[PDB]
Subunit: 257 residues, 6 copies
């Protein structure tokens, strides 16, 4: 029931929600700027899904039976004027009252936890150690892990964020493998600055939802500029783990202290 | 209420306020050019909010429950032709009569005071030493300080400017942490877009016309070689600028009501 | 038939399939993002063509006399909102149940197999050793091999993917020579646009969902200095890749149904 | 009464003036190309303002009371085909009959007199020595000079050009401080060539009007490419004074001889 | 009778030929992608002109009298969706049955034969040695050769290709001097890669038509990257001849054998 | 009269002349491609003006009081499909029958004669020695010569070319001082845009078709390193070119009816 083509042309219609093709977010809609795109998470749909999934005796069966409903948690509004009305849009830094965390580390701030670098088999071996519920697979070549793993395959950034948000909000532990297409598709030392603010935007969405989502990221930096890029990433998110040669090279985490 | 999609299509319509979809600012509307965007502050709504906030119990409480007044204080006019009708738009350098200032420095000119460079801890250390009413939080990853500190989180430049304007016109002390998105988001043709400097002069002179000072954290992320030439360009754009090197003041320039002040540290 | 100029203008039309001008893929439609283009494969038409092709006398004769069915197997949807509605679109990694493979290698994951590097004679030599049904020829200057060899000449990326898909689904062995126009046509932000790597990951996962392998000749034309980097980024994008050193296999990497195999020769 | 949004859609409407939304200048309209913008000076409005100001007993009060009318001297035509119809538009080089000048120097050609380089106090020290009527302040941060100086603060290029044109036609001596925002806004050794042709355009508008307007300009050139950028500017305008360390380093002026 | 401004707006109109403003090439239309342009050769008009010229008793008279018909062999379709409908368009490599060639070399594949580098007198002296029927002059300043030579002067790429295609189909021997305006006009080591794909596309039109067209081309590479640029060109066409100091430096040709 | 805003919207309107808003030049219209602009010369209006001017008392007077005939001689067609319909448009190399020339040199091919480089005094001294009827002044700061000398000042490229065309056709000697705005205004992909080279060839061949020579001051502003290469690319674009070094001829090259001439100085 998301408007796909018809957008507000009167003041009366412009006041409706983003879902209906208006330009004013409802209380339960959070806009997420990614590059020059603007997505929206419907926190009512998100919470309906998280609650159904957290309260289920068979969470796997409800998941499979409502994939379409889960994916609809995030969508791209149709109204073209959003960039103008919300200039230099980000997501505000909020933490829900009573938030608590023990994973990925103790008192980990809600937000993103980037897993960067790694052998490739050092990635997958680090993901296996984190006791994840599933791995959301996006933008990566099909390998064995997609065939007989605890995975969920998606096609676009709406589906990736929607599943991670729903799983984490239901109390489970998701990871996204990976933001490869987000590193390639956003363009503006050596890395597009828009990648950093995209990560802060998605990070602060998780912050507002009181969740952590682990995400694999390969910034494709020359190994000279790699320390400066990794530092600009740590400055954008709640936590970051660098893997070099399959071992944890360094981890830096904002904590609630 | 602010027009969002219907803009002037006739000459009679074109002559209305920016709020109404026209192309002619009312006397109480000031345009704010930022890059290829044009915002507007409504000084009537600004005055109404400043009076209400100056008398309320809690400043952080009033803001979170008056979102609809804040969204009306600074907005992005809908009309397209603004860029053409006002070529190379800036904001005029104007100080109100009888303006006074003791913060951030004595006789500090109205405008922006940029806090640039340093570390995240030295940035927190510096603003904590400034007796701010609260820090407006924009464009930065949520951290411990967002839970335990006196903050107000916002999502776009309209909200950041509006909250700072209202707090200052009500006699409070705002800082904005930070203009990260304005550094990343504006892009033109060293190493740093020249439109960043014109955007800061514009926002500076709006603060000037409003007779206020807004402190703003800015990390321009210039090369260590080009850092000093970028810091000179930014200092020439604003009322005041403080450069931090490891929590301490490394350089300062301030325009005052009687002249200029400089500072040298390290 | 495929809509060419009339696209969804109402919400009810937007629910229709891509073929019909809508914005929502039917169950039997898979979107293929290539750079800033979005193609679509109709798996129902694909399954029909593969059954017809498997029962025909000549595979080259069938394709030349069924251009209308091929142009329906892969097309470019007309609706313009596709980029907005599916942000950063990829193709998802799937493997059909009971997929098996003994070519190009044993237990080769479905997807693309890139043949990169080498000379024109070394490339032509290697394809001759692969026991291909025919070579799909696209974007290259006509040569003697187009007269004397088992070939099918095509004009655009739709026809090239359609022919390869129908053949592989019919049990034949296609190779595409080459992706020259895709290398030249996709441009973005080293030395090589990163939209090349995501385009092949997208085409690789379409083959993956179809349970097929398509051999593809690629010459990314990186400076010999950065040539090792680019080959490693391409290997990371696909199921398999072979590098030819002057006619013979210099390197080879393949994702398999069990693990990952590396060949190093030269 | 300047057309703001409605432009010519028929051949009959296209032949009307720029003020009316047409594509053909009236005899009293001069087009001014600046970058990819096209402005227009209405010489009838200009001369009406110059006369009232020059004839007034209290020139200060008349301009205090007629700011809006003065600023309407220069405007941006709404008609969009002007770029096509007048390809590579400039302003023609004319000198009115009987032109005569003793400032900035003797026999100074009408046009711009650029004041380039110098320091912040070196600039203001030079402008004070030129016996100006007022300084038009544009695109610069507010300072003490804007509090208690003989200044007029403006917001855009229409207003800056309008006041200078009217002031100088009335027999007064204006300066613009500065073209900062024009140096920044025009993009195309090391400086945008469009900046050079913009100042030639504005220069030739002044020559057609028989006036000299003094203009502060900082081109932001690296000092390797400095003398060369400065030579390129002198080649675009009537006169140029270079300041360094507050002193007049160099000065070149086209004279009527 | 080519649609110049009115393009298909319905599905029924879209199915018509490129000439009629449709999006679907007829059997006798071949699309030619050049940079971001799409041209089309009408092979029925092509063979009408070629036969009339090959059969005429006074071929010069027939072409003097039918210039406008010859030039209509190639045109630019009006329909705008062609870029979307035919993604990454090329021209398919075909060779007609029974194709034979003895010039420019024995068994020369059909396609373009490029003449690169050299000097002005080196180029001219080479084309004289090839026994050409005429030289098609395009994008070059008028010289003595355009007054007293066996030349046909043209203005755009449609006309240049149209005359070359007709002349060669009729059994004559044309050359195009030159593709200068194509090297300049197509923008994307040192040379725009779109120059290469454009040459391959035009090359393959010739191969489908079973002809060879000789074309002068100056890619204007820096002398270091020149021998790389020449190799990328030879990898795009059937034959290439490098002139340096008026002598044939290098020559590589694909043969039918 | 020239259509300024209404362009062909039907196939019947599309076949009218460029003057009328169509897409097909009349027999007496010649399109002139300059950068991404397309101009047109009307040789019928050109012929009428050239007769009127040839019989008038004063050339400078006739031009100033016939601006309407001039703007009608060269104009920018309104129809937008022109770039598509005429791909990579140039002007064709043609010489009218019986053309002859003693200026600027004997048997000089019709086209442009570029006067390049030097100083402002060397250019002024060189043009003064050329017996020009008048100098067409375009895109230059007004100077003493605009008061004391024989000039016609113009504003855009249309009227600069029109005045030159009318004068040369009526047997007078025009020079354009200068193509500065053309060097600054056309931007493409060394150091100097290749589109500058194609624009001069286009304008050169219009003059060639009109059987006239027009002298044009051009300062391409090349680095002293790349000036050799830039000057050779310009010489290869036009009929004649004269390079001035400090007032004297340093290099010259001219295509003539019988062949070519070179000059070497310094």
């Amino acid at each position: 029931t998301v408007a796909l083509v018809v957008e507000a042309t009167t003041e009366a219609e412009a006041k409706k929600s983003l879902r209906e093709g208006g330009l004013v977010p409802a209380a339960h809609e959070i806009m997420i700027p990614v590059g020059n795109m603007i997505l929206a998470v419907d926190t009512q749909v998100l919470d309906k899904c998280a609650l159904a999934l957290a309260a289920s005796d068979d969470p796997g069966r409800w998941f499979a039976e409502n994939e379409s409903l889960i994916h609809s948690t995030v969508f791209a509004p149709v109204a073209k004027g959003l960039h103008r009305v919300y200039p230099l849009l980000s997501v505000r830094p909020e933490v829900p009252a009573g938030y608590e965390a023990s994973w990925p580390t103790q008192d980990h701030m809600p937000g993103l936890h980037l897993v960067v670098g790694g052998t490739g088999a050092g990635k997958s071996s680090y993901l296996a150690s984190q006791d994840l519920t599933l791995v959301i697979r996006w933008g990566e070549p099909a390998e064995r892990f997609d065939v007989e793993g605890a995975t969920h395959a998606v096609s676009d950034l709406n589906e990736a964020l929607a599943v991670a948000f729903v799983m984490a909000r239901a109390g489970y532990r998701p990871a996204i493998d990976s933001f490869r297409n987000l590193v390639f598709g956003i363009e503006s030392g050596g890395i597009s600055t828009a990648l950093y603010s995209a990560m802060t935007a998605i990070n602060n969405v998780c912050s507002r939802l009181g969740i952590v989502v682990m995400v694999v990221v390969n910034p494709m930096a020359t190994e000279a500029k790699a320390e400066l890029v990794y530092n600009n990433m740590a400055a954008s998110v709640a936590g970051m783990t660098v893997l070099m040669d399959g071992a944890v090279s360094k981890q830096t985490v904002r904590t609630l202290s």
